[PDB]
């Protein structure tokens, strides 16, 4: 018992060229039936399956981003020089010292030390509580790959198409030419927590002249610590008959603190299925912010005679149902697809009713029995859902009671207004 739920029939009078713009986290399923222009009853299946985008980024390990606390201390001496004694800030992890050597007058002098031009006033800015807050990587190069499978008549061919490669067969050619990317080289990816949580994108990550407060000021490189300088100047505040204290009118908040303050002003990104090594970082972008340009061309010299002997026979039967026919609940259909006269055959099964088809599922069937699950949403009260191939469907169906990041394009003519609100 078959029903008119076939695929788009395309006569091969001329070559079949196609251009695609695949989103980042999207898998395409384009299938038609190429018709011999010399015989209306000679048709061969053509299936095109393209996977998601795999982003391969050769990166440079920048290290760990450290967060510290600002501290300032002052050290006064009556006689000697500033380069004679030691100070507790000189032994810290990061420290910057500005000393007023031989600048002991009398207005800044304490009640002790009745001398002029003989003292020393050293000021030390150091950072404590250094703790790692995230990991930083720098993009060196980018590479985008997609896995494509074709099914023409009885032939099946698969390949991982790169930017400098194409899946070329005797009749079909699939090329990957362009890629619009959110990421580009010389960018800095910062992961605050683990990888799966995503991260942020920084462009002006300081490398040579880092200051306290800039993104990347304090870094825990594998060679050692890399401390920045300060954004400000020193001054000596003093009163009469008091020890001269040291002031610093500059930036006090660290780079991580300012980043948390204005985190909304930076670019965010997510990752899925991450794989990081000592040289690369592979992941799939789920935000669908990248587009790949794919060119497919099928010549009209298909030789319909060679692709017609012993085609792939497919039988199916609906065996189980679970869910509801309401628009929003969804139902799950189980099909027992039996493939014969072919070792492997790439096609797709649809869950159809008397009128429409509310779901599809692409699967590479093996010679024998195959269990296929199909998800669907919609239907009416008396909708008897069945499993369906191109034209042939199951003998019986089942009835129910009371997105997925896949794209299906089979060229089937959808039902008009007669199937709306019935």
């Amino acid at each position, epitope marked *: 018992t078959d029903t008119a739920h076939g695929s788009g029939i395309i006569p091969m009078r001329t070559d079949l060229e196609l251009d695609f713009s695949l989103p980042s986290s999207a898998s395409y399923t384009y299938r038609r039936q190429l018709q011999n222009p010399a015989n209306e009853q000679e048709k061969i299946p053509f299936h095109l399956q393209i996977s998601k985008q795999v982003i391969h980024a050769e990166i440079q390990h920048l290290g760990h981003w450290m967060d510290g606390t600002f501290n300032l201390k002052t050290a006064f001496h009556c006689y000697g020089s500033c380069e004679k004694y030691a100070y507790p800030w000189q032994t810290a992890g990061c420290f910057i010292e500005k000393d007023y050597e031989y600048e002991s007058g009398w207005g800044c002098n304490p009640p002790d030390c009745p001398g002029v031009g003989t003292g020393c006033t050293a000021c030390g800015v150091y950072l404590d509580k250094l703790k790692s807050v995230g990991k930083a990587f720098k993009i*060196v190069s980018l590479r985008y790959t997609r896995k494509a499978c074709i099914q023409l008549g009885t032939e099946q061919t698969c390949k991982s198409v790169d*930017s400098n490669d194409c899946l070329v067969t005797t009749s079909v050619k699939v090329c990957l030419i362009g890629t619009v990317s959110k990421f580009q080289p*010389s960018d800095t990816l910062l992961f605050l927590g683990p990888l799966e949580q995503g991260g942020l994108i920084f462009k002006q990550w300081c490398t040579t002249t880092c200051q306290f407060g800039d993104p990347g000021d304090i870094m825990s490189t594998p060679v050692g610590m890399k401390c920045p300088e300060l954004n400000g100047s020193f001054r000596k505040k003093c009163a009469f008959a008091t020890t001269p204290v040291c002031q610093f009118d500059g930036n006090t908040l660290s780079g991580y603190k300012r980043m948390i303050a204005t985190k909304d002003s930076f670019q965010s990104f997510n990752v899925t299925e991450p794989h990081i090594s000592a040289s690369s970082l592979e992941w799939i972008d789920p935000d669908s912010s990248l587009r790949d340009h794919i060119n497919v061309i099928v010549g009209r010299d298909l030789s319909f005679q060679d692709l017609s002997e012993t085609p792939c026979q497919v039988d199916l039967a609906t065996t189980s149902i679970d869910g509801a026919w309401g628009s929003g609940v969804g139902f799950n259909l189980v099909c027992s697809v039996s493939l014969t006269e072919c070792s492997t055959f790439l096609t797709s099964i649809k869950a159809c009713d008397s009128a429409m088809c509310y779901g599809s599922t692409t699967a590479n069937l093996l010679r024998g029995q195959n269990t296929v699950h199909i998800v669907g949403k919609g239907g009416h009260s008396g909708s008897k859902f069945m499993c369906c191939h191109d034209t042939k469907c199951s003998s019986t169906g089942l009835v129910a009671a009371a997105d997925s990041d896949k794209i299906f394009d089979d060229g089937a003519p959808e039902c008009g207004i007669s199937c709306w609100f019935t």
Partner: antibody, heavy 118, light 110 residues
Framework: GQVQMKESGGGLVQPGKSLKLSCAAS????????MSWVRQPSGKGLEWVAR????????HYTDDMKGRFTISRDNAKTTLYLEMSPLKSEDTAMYYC??????????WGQGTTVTVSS | TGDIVMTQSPAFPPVSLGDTVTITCQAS??????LAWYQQKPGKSPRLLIF???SLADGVPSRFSASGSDKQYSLKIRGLQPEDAAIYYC?????????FGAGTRLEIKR
């Protein structure tokens, strides 16, 4: 710690004989980077020759040496190889083994001289 | 061949020591950010200077910098020294084949 790469296996060969070049790398994970060979004639510009991936199933060559050059690697000893078919007089140059980062080359070796003369 | 050509202008006039110099590298096609600069000292092996058109390589002094507009890039050196007087190359790696440049040699004026 430090990255160090040394070439070897070069010298003088007859115009029409084979020659295999070796390159030992150390100081980094050899089984995580793409490797590549780049030669340069006497006082001329650089010329990319070949490129190999991590395992060795994907090898890129130039349209000139159609099957003449064969790049291989051994991750157990961290070594790079470049087998060459019967050469010609236009292959006399100095070959460097580089650490290909899918594009730019971030580390170059000392380089060995290959002379093809009679 | 339909490959991209990286025009690197040789024969640069000598410049005094301690000043600022700038070398250009023109492209036959826009590669947008996939540009690397190299340095080859006389007799020694090449050395990666700058990757990603703006990122300094490890072990390169802070007096090096690079930028550029569409298909027109530059490499700036501030505070010249007698050491970094060699030949510089530019390589694009946007689309295959990844081609190199011609080469520009500096000359310190003493």
């Amino acid at each position: 710690g430090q990255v160090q790469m040394k070439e070897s296996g070069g010298g003088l060969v007859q115009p029409g004989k084979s020659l295999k070049l070796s390159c030992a790398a150390s100081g980094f994970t050899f089984s995580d980077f793409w490797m590549s060979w780049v030669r340069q004639p006497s006082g001329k510009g650089l010329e990319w020759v070949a490129r190999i991936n991590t395992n060795g199933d994907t090898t890129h060559y130039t349209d000139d040496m159609k099957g003449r050059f064969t790049i291989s690697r051994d991750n157990a000893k961290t070594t790079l190889y470049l087998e060459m078919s019967p050469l010609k007089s236009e292959d006399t140059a100095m070959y460097y083994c580089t650490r290909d980062r899918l594009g730019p080359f971030d580390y170059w070796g000392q380089g060995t001289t290959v002379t093809v003369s009679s | 061949t339909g490959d991209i050509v990286m025009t690197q202008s040789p024969a640069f006039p000598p410049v005094s020591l301690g000043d600022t110099v700038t070398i250009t590298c023109q492209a036959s096609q826009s590669v947008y950010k996939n540009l690397a600069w190299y340095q080859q000292k006389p007799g020694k092996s090449p050395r990666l200077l700058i990757f990603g058109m703006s990122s300094l390589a490890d072990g390169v002094p802070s007096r090096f910098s690079a930028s550029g507009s569409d298909k027109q890039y530059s490499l700036k050196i501030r505070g010249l020294q007698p050491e970094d007087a060699a030949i510089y190359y530019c390589q694009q790696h946007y689309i295959a084949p990844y081609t190199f440049g011609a080469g520009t040699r500096l000359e310190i004026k003493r």
